[PDB]
Amino acid sequence: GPVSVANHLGEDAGHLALRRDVYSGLQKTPKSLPPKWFYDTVGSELFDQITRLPEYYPTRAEAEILRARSAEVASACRADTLVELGSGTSEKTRMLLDALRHRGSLRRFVPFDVDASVLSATATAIQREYSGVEINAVCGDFEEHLTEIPRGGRRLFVFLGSTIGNLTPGPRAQFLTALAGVMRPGDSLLLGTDLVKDAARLVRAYDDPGGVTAQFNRNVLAVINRELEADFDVDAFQHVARWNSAEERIEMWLRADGRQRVRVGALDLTVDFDAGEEMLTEVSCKFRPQAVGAELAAAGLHRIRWWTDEAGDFGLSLAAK
Ligand SMILES: Cc1cncc2cccc(S(=O)(=O)N3CCCN(C(=O)CN)C[C@@H]3C)c12
């Protein structure tokens, strides 16, 4: 099938975005950094390890559902084009394409991410594996370029992994209204949401006894040190995984053991860390079944399917425009 990549990000947009996030994020109280910056090369290898950890259930909880329900997703959505808000490198991607292909209605795959190299490998993969499929990879980000996604016949947008949990309720509702707006009648959105559960089970999923999440979390300091000429005594920052009972969300913090002071060279900046001061690096909001349909209805979408794994740990929503 025909391949195409459209690149809406300038050659520097990545490093430019990094430069302002840590510049602004290190001057907040408390200091905070978006979780997008975890995922350099060693960060992605660390995450793929995380998905294989016994304690990290969401990855396998969502694959359990998708293995069982993919033909339903297809027959409900009846979509000829699968739009992935992600890299397209997972096996869940394949299960969704297989379902659409089995239905007989698969024409077009649209991977949508901010890394053209990943989009290209993905585009080659899907081209070698699915003759007949047009791959129209789009390289952009959500706030500006969701409008650049092609139209096709009838579109299944897919945002899995409970990645939507990284948006607190403000940006979450804003992200969904805008995604609802680029959607048109007949299109649907397939949404993965990790569910509220035993707080011990939640914290343990982000502080594995093996420490793989710990080095994954402090890898954002390794990224800032490398890409921006900084001097984080990375080991002096302790991994902290918190359950926030009032907000119902996991939080990953890096706690500074003793007073620290750090200079970020590319930004001519120096920031201080009090002894025991924490810096927020990721939020995973945990969800409730009807509250997810509610949020989808407030974005202008209407849920028509809900599914969980055998234990009720993870949920997948299907929502029509
Ligand atoms: C989904 C996605 C969409 N668009 C751009 C992306 C750019 C880089 C990485 C991903 S991502 O796929 O690597 N992503 C990241 C956030 C944490 N996530 C959690 O689940 C936390 N509990 C989910 C999952 C690991 C992107």
3-state helix, strand, coil in the chain (%, to 5): 45, 25, 30
Calculate the dihedral angle through the C-alpha atoms of 115, 120, 126, 131, rounding to the nearest 10 degrees: 140
What is the per-residue DSSP string for 199-220? Answer: HHHHHHTTS-TT-HHHHHHTHH
How many other CB atoms sit within 10 Å of the CB of residue 28?
11
Residue 206 CA to ligand 1 center (angstroms) comes to 15
The strand pair at 314-320 and 269-273 is best described as unpaired
Gap between the Cα atoms of 319 and 293, Å rounded: 8
Q: Is the shortest distance between the CB of 188 and ligand 1 below 6 Å? A: no
Gap between the Cα atoms of 157 and 138, Å rounded: 13
Gap between the Cα atoms of 144 and 282, Å rounded: 23
Residue from 138, 163, 216 to probe ligand 1 pocket by mutation (most atoms less than 8 Å from CB) = 163
Experimental method: X-ray
* Selection from 202, 163, 200, 198 nearest residue 179 by Cα: 163
Residues 286 and 170 sit within 8 Å (Cβ to Cβ) = no
- Tokens representing 198 are 């035993």
- Tokens representing 316 are 């997948």
3-state secondary structure of 159: strand
Q: Is the shortest distance between the CB of 111 and ligand 1 below 6 Å? A: no
* Selection from 82, 285, 249 nearest residue 173 by Cα: 285
Q: Is the shortest distance between the CB of 300 and ligand 1 below 6 Å? A: no
Residue 275 CA to ligand 1 center (angstroms) comes to 31
In our burial notation (b when 16+ CB lie closer than 10 A, e otherwise), range 44-61 reads bebbebbeebebbbbbbb
Atom 12 (ligand 1) nearest CA: 86
Amino acid code (one letter) for 225: N
Is residue 284 a known part of a binding site? yes
Q: Is the shortest distance between the CB of 120 and ligand 1 below 6 Å? A: no
- Tokens representing 61 are 């909880």
Provide the angle, in degrees to the nearest 10, between the axes of the packed helices 58-77 and 41-51. Answer: 90
Give the burial class of 41: count Cβ atoms within 10 A of its Cβ; 0-12 exposed, 13-18 middle, 19 or more buried.
exposed
Is residue 273 a known part of a binding site? no
The strand pair at 237-244 and 249-256 is best described as antiparallel
Peptide bond into 54 cis (omega under 30): no
* Selection from 149, 89, 148 nearest residue 122 by Cα: 89
The data reach a resolution, in angstroms, of 2.4
